[PDB]
Design a protein around this ligand. Structure first.
Ligand SMILES: [Zn+2]
Ligand SMILES: [Zn+2]
Lengths: 43, 45, 116, 279, 98, 180, 106, 87
């Protein structure tokens, strides 16, 4: 047996990092996360 | 080789091709590029 | 909200299914089950391609196109029925309790090159 | 047949010609007379702007599933008609290799370039008398070490052995052939820093060892029988040059090394302490 | 093979301009080439080169102004990569929106 | 060259021509190591000539540790005589040496890195388990193990003569690759 | 120029710095000289060195322009100083370590 | 709240990757034809429904003598109840 074969970090890491990078909250939910807008401070 | 500058350590670097992209004195991995020497001309318009 | 998620909702997500079992039957039945205990979140950092791992500040993340996150770790009990484990990295919101900047001072924010 | 096209100004003809592509006009012109040779140029970045053959070759693929407008009496048979041609292809052992090694290098926390070289290093050899099976691990255990080192990241045999238990022997024979597979188809420095971080040390202690280990290597002291060990002694050499508690016993298990090789290795160091003086 | 009719002289040896250099439209900013097999395609005039097809990045066809700063790092995977920033001054003009 | 490839082991096969009672062979011998739980062959070490031999239920004996064709041959004849004293009419028939492995020295330090790197096609190296190079020759077909100490381990011949020929061929390579 | 201002930004401020031009008829329109674009018969040359030395900020003023071409006795080119502390127009600010060197042509 | 691990980042990740250590927590670690026939007749006589395993364990001798020499006067069925039975 080994944990390292069982526990697969690349599950979580790649999960969150993907639902942030695209807006696809998964799908079924898109545009949840957008590139921050820095035209001017108040925007 | 050409001059570079650490981003934080801020030391002139002068590495070459196939050297590590890495700063002495801090293994910081960001380098700027040591602005040109030839003069540059603007108009005060 | 993010602060709340990191403090509580993370832990309670883990411990709602803290265990999972497995039993095999013999001629006496061997049974296995794995526990999930405390959870630990580091301060943000990156593991460089060489192998080295070090703190990651938000400037460096933006320049080098990294992801500003910190690792997750949980304790486990393995149970044979008749230490802390990496599980992945949590992207951090800036200025949140777990971010390097959360408590930094102005004169320090300039040092890190972050607009106050 | 030769099926080949070449352009040349039929009114200069002087050369293998001097022509330029005016892209923004969709033209190619004789750079001498400016006769336009051929026009209606087709774009070259917009093409892939709207958007693995090195592995997946010519037998193509397409992920077939269930849409919104299908009931389970048609969906599951798409899962029951896709299963009739998985053995004419050895490609299960092709993809399930990649999927496995992808599952490996990724779980191993490795750069996604190594993943490719191993997705390569499998695919290039992928069947040989030397291979002839041999547990199908040792390659995915060596093609990674290949894919690792070939991607300029070197890891110890034990380190992969942690990932996959290869009996340490099925590894060795499989490696030799593999390396020679590419040679026919045709570096321990990497260990100093990955170790320092494993001990959580500032850069200078690691900074120095590159000088010391190279200098200890450069003159004499073959020293080591798998120089993995005599790497670490540089840290131990240099950590004692500093005064930071990494006591020998803590070193060992953290890096899974014999303690004996340290002190005896450090024998050649408590005596060679002469020439490592940079400051 | 397959170079851009824009100039390359503004580059340095390492395929980068240096901060301070005034550039104009259709000037190669980042010089990159991807090696090709001598016999990979033989497209046109490969028989003299055998080496490499260029993949440099030219400045936009309508922009200009001075390179402001150039930084060089490695991505997560230790691959070199570079970010060039170009600075322009926009003076109000006739069709501009206020 | 000027260096004789010094044999360290000769492994040879001897057909005694009888189905030997390996139990009685072990019983009537003076110091013989035979138990079925390791092999189906009585292993005898005779100090003169000091050779170690495994003799099977087929009566075939393979002999190792000899320092010559004649060390092994005389040892095998003594082995057959011992078997006949045991009670089986062993006979030296269709003998053949199946292996002649030797170690000698050329004594000049070698750029083993140069050979292995430039003869990657022929020789492979992973210096993190075993510091020796492996080299092949077809004429004569000798495989040679090389180490920085100058030791040459020549193997792959029924005779020391192929050892000699490939050594006369490979010593010039060694001197060519001599590190200094 | 390692200040915190862009060049064309600074260059634009230099243009607006009002120079002494009482005796300006004794100059010529730079498209009437035959010089290789400029000479003392058609232009005045100044220069500006500044270096941030104190730990405090250090201000560059128009009074720090120094003429480095032969005026030929004509009375032109000096930066007008209307103020009472005798510093003219503030041009830039410098923190220690920051440098500005440039050459202007009026 | 969470004990946000106060260590340096470098040390903690050391054990996550290839630490080359394991098993620190024990868990899922995982010949006479006369005598053979005399026992084979004994195997046949004592229990005609004599499976090979019940015979091989009772053989306690080389596998050759029990399986081969007994194959003549003992008939072994393959399927059904009295299968593999030296009856
Ligand atoms: Zn023409
Ligand atoms: Zn003039």
């Amino acid at each position: 047996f080994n944990m390292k074969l069982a526990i697969n970090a690349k599950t979580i890491t790649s999960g969150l990092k993907y639902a942030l990078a695209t807006g696809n909250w998964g799908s079924s939910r898109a545009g949840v996360s957008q590139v921050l807008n820095r035209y001017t401070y108040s925007s | 080789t050409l001059k570079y500058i650490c981003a934080e350590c801020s030391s002139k670097l002068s590495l070459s091709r196939t050297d590590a992209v890495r700063c002495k004195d801090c293994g910081h991995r960001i380098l700027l590029k040591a602005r040109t020497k030839r003069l540059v001309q603007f108009e005060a318009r | 909200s993010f602060n709340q998620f990191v403090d509580y909702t993370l832990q309670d997500i883990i411990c709602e299914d803290s265990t999972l079992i497995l039993e095999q039957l013999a001629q006496i039945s061997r049974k296995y089950e794995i526990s999930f205990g405390k959870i630990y979140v580091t301060k943000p950092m990156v593991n460089e391609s060489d192998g080295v791992t070090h703190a990651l500040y938000p400037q460096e993340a933006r320049l080098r196109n990294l992801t500003y996150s910190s690792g997750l770790f949980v304790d486990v009990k393995k149970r044979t029925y008749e230490g802390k484990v990496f599980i992945g990295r949590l992207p951090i919101m800036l200025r949140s309790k777990n971010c390097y900047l959360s408590e930094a001072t102005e004169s320090d924010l300039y040092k890190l090159k972050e607009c106050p | 047949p030769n099926l080949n096209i070449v352009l040349t100004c039929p009114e200069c003809k002087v050369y293998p010609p001097k022509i330029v592509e005016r892209f923004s006009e969709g033209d190619v012109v004789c750079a001498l007379c400016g006769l336009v040779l051929s026009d209606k140029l087709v774009d070259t970045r917009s093409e892939w702007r709207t958007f693995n053959p090195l592995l997946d070759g010519n037998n193509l693929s397409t992920r077939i599933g269930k849409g919104e407008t299908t009931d389970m009496r048609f969906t599951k048979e798409l899962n029951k008609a896709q299963g009739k041609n998985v053995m004419d292809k050895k490609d299960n052992e092709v993809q399930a290799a990649f999927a496995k090694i992808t599952m490996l290098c990724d779980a191993a926390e490795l750069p996604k370039i190594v993943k490719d070289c191993a997705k390569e290093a499998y695919k290039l050899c992928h069947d040989e008398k030397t291979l002839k099976g041999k547990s199908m691990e040792s390659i995915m255990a060596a093609s990674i070490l290949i894919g690792c080192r070939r991607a300029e990241v070197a890891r110890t045999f034990k380190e992969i052995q942690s990932l996959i238990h290869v009996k340490t022997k099925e590894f060795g024979k499989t490696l030799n052939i593999m390396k020679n597979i590419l040679r026919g188809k045709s570096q321990n420095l990497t260990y100093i820093p990955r170790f320092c971080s494993h001990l959580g040390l500032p850069m200078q202690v690691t900074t120095s060892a590159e000088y010391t280990a190279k200098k200890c290597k450069e003159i004499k002291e073959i020293a080591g029988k798998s120089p993995i060990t005599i790497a670490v002694v540089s840290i131990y050499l240099n950590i004692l040059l500093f005064q930071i508690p990494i006591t020998a016993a803590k070193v060992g298990q953290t890096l899974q090394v014999t303690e004996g090789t340290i002190k005896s290795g450090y024998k050649i160091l408590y005596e060679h302490r002469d020439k490592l003086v940079d400051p | 093979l397959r170079m851009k009719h824009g100039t390359y002289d503004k580059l340095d040896d390492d395929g980068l301009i240096a901060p301070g250099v005034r550039v104009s439209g259709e000037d190669v900013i980042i010089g990159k080439t991807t090696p090709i097999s001598p016999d990979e395609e033989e497209l046109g005039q490969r028989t003299a080169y055998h080496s490499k097809r260029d993949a440099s990045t030219p400045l936009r066809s309508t922009e200009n102004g001075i390179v402001d700063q150039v930084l060089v790092t490695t991505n997560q995977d230790g691959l070199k990569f570079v970010k060039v920033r170009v600075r322009t001054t926009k003076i109000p003009q006739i069709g501009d929106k206020f | 060259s000027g260096i004789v490839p010094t044999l360290q082991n000769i492994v040879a096969t001897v057909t005694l021509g009888c189905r030997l009672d390996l139990k009685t062979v072990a019983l009537h011998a003076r110091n013989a190591e035979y138990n079925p739980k390791r092999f189906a062959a009585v292993i005898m070490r005779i100090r003169e000539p000091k050779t170690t031999a495994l003799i099977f239920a087929s009566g075939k004996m393979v002999v190792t540790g000899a320092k010559s064709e004649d060390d092994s041959k005389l040892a095998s004849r003594k082995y057959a005589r011992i078997i006949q004293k045991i009670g089986f009419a062993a006979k030296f028939t269709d003998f053949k040496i199946q292996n002649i492995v030797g170690s000698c020295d050329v004594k000049f330090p070698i750029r083993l890195e140069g050979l292995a790197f430039s003869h990657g096609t022929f020789s492979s190296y992973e210096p993190e388990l075993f510091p020796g190079l492996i080299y092949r020759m077809v004429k004569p077909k000798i495989v040679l193990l090389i180490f920085v100490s100058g030791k040459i381990v020549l193997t792959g011949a029924k005779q020391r003569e192929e050892i000699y020929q490939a050594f006369e061929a490979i010593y010039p390579v060694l001197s060519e690759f001599r590190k200094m | 120029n390692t200040t915190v201002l862009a060049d064309e930004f600074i260059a634009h401020r230099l243009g607006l710095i009002p120079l002494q031009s009482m005796d300006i008829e004794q100059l010529e329109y730079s498209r009437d000289c035959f010089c290789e674009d400029h000479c003392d018969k058609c232009s005045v040359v100044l220069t500006l060195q500044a270096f941030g030395e104190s730990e405090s900020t250090t201000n560059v003023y128009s009074k720090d322009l120094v003429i480095v071409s032969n005026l030929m006795g004509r009375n032109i080119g000096h930066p007008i100083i209307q103020d009472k502390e005798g510093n003219g127009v503030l041009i830039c600010k410098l923190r220690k370590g920051q440098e500005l060197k440039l050459t202007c042509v009026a | 709240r969470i004990t946000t691990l106060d260590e340096t980042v470098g040390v903690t990740m050391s054990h996550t990757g290839m630490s080359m250590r394991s098993d620190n927590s024990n868990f899922l670690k995982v010949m006479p034809k006369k005598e053979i026939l005399d026992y084979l007749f004994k195997l046949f006589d004592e229990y005609d429904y004599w499976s090979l395993k019940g015979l091989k364990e009772r053989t306690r001798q080389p596998e050759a003598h029990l399986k081969e020499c007994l194959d003549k006067v003992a008939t072994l069925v393959k399927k059904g109840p009295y299968a593999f039975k030296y009856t």
